[PDB]
Design a protein around this ligand. Sequence first.
Ligand SMILES: [Zn+2]
Ligand SMILES: [Zn+2]
Lengths: 108, 92
Amino acid sequence: ANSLEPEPWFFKNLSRKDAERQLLAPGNTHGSFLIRESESTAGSFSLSVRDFDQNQGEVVKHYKIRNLDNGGFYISPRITFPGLHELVRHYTNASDGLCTRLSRPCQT
Amino acid sequence: SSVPTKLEVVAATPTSLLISWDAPAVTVLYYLITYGETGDHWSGHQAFEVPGSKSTATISGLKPGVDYTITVYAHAESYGESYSPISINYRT
Ligand SMILES: [Zn+2]
Ligand SMILES: [Zn+2]
């Protein structure tokens, strides 16, 4: 309800690959995350998260945030949320199946 | 124990599956159904919602000769934890 524009973790029109270079910029580590809106389909969001290193190389994972008919969102069908704000605080409390706990907004 | 119970395929073509399950006693507003090739990581599965009043669903656009894992998640509230999911495997 326009409440995403002040969020430090929200990035408007940001592509998957721009999310990766953003999350690999200096100042980020595992847990660094952003939510981005898809550039083609307005209203469909992704979660991008700086993961644990693999084989001394940096890793960034991506998750589709899916849309409920009732307006809510979910990543895993085991737990659904009324908005992105509750989704973000839930995965900041625990990884709960994500590669890593959300720990810090992506630093620019 | 899971909600729903008795997930089974009840029809198949090389590119689609119809699934049905035992109507639950408990309240269900909506199901979330995921499907994808067995072995693939869950974050790449497809997913879609069916209303809590249906007890069947159609999954289409599949590739023939592939092992799919199909999981049904029942939600008793608008938002929150699902019941324990129920899951089956089937090859097209
Ligand atoms: Zn039977
Ligand atoms: Zn595969």
